[PDB]
């Protein structure tokens, strides 16, 4: 039980190139099996990835009532709690310098350049990484010539969740098992692990903190038709230490559709048309949580699978 390992070092993966097919193959193979995979990314360097986590601790470091000014939506961007557990929030629209500038003079009245300057630059690097593998993705199914339509005003999410020192070695739960909803989820664990995968078997992957983990969310598995697994995951502290993640996701601009050419007589159109906001909203209410462990039980499902 251990993920695939893809080498995404920037070098040679122009598109066409003998080193991006073999890739494209390995990606496609991982999101269909496994969901997930480990990442060798040098889009960002080790320099970086410790401001950014920096930055991430700097913001959750405000006081509550500075963090509330960014709104009451905890499914996206808001700031959220469960008390001596974990916390966690995000920076909306992370690759829109604008948004990017209003969210930090919103947080710092006096300035913070650094911290804009930072954040942003990783939110870019993230977001290539993230457009490169959907390319591939869309490449591996014939739907290449779909693809720049597809990715037309994607939303990008740069989140932050810390879990607090558990008290205790061994193994300490610290975050649900649910799907995410992006499209892809890149994650950093800054050098303490504790996210924790399941298999479609029913066993459970817990990889080291050394690499990125790239993660299919419900939007791609329903865009593929259910062809990639959107995998279920949860975060175990293995160790009496303080754990930070660093999160980037990917969001459609409005709408998910299935396109024709992934259904067929063995493959039954799974979902219907739906729009992203609704979604995440939705699986954040009493009578919707139900779709949090499953598209399948949100309003979109067409009942294909009887
Ligand atoms: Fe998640």
Redesign the pocket.
């Known amino acids: 039980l251990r993920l695939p390992v893809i080498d995404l070092s920037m070098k040679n993966l122009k598109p066409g190139t003998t080193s991006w097919n073999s890739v494209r193959t390995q990606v496609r193979e991982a999101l269909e099996e496994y969901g997930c995979f480990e990442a060798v990314i040098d889009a960002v360097s080790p320099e970086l990835q410790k401001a950014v986590c920096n930055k991430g601790h700097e913001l959750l470091n405000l006081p509550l009532e500075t963090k509330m000014l960014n709104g009451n939506k905890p499914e996206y961007d808001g700031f959220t709690s469960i008390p001596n557990l974990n916390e966690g929030m995000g920076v909306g629209r992370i690759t829109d310098l604008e948004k990017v500038e209003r969210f930090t003079n919103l947080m710092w009245p006096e300035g913070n350049k650094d911290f804009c300057e930072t954040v942003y630059s990783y939110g870019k690097r993230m977001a290539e990484v993230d457009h490169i593998l959907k390319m591939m993705v869309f490449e591996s199914f014939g739907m290449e010539k779909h693809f720049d339509s597809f990715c037309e005003s994607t939303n990008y999410l740069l989140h932050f969740m810390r879990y607090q020192q558990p008290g205790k070695d061994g193994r300490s739960p610290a ?1 649900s098992l ?3 909803k ?1 499209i892809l ?1 890149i ?1 950093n664990q800054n050098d303490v692990k504790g ?1 924790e995968f399941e298999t479609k078997d029913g066993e459970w992957i817990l990889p080291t903190a050394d690499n990125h983990i790239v ?1 299919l ?1 419900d939007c791609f598995m329903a865009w593929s038709n259910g062809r990639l697994h959107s995998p279920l ?1 949860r975060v175990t502290l293995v160790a009496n230490q303080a754990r930070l993640s660093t ?1 980037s996701f990917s969001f459609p601009k409005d709408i998910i559709e299935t396109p024709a050419e992934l259904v067929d007589e063995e493959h039954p159109l799974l979902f219907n048309p739906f729009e992203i906001t609704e979604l995440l909203a939705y699986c954040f209410t009493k009578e919707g949580a139900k779709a949090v462990c499953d598209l399948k039980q949100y309003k979109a499902y067409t009942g294909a699978l009887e």
Do not use: E, P, R, W
């Open positions: 975050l649910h799907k995410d992006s989820t994650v996210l993660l969310g995951h999160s």
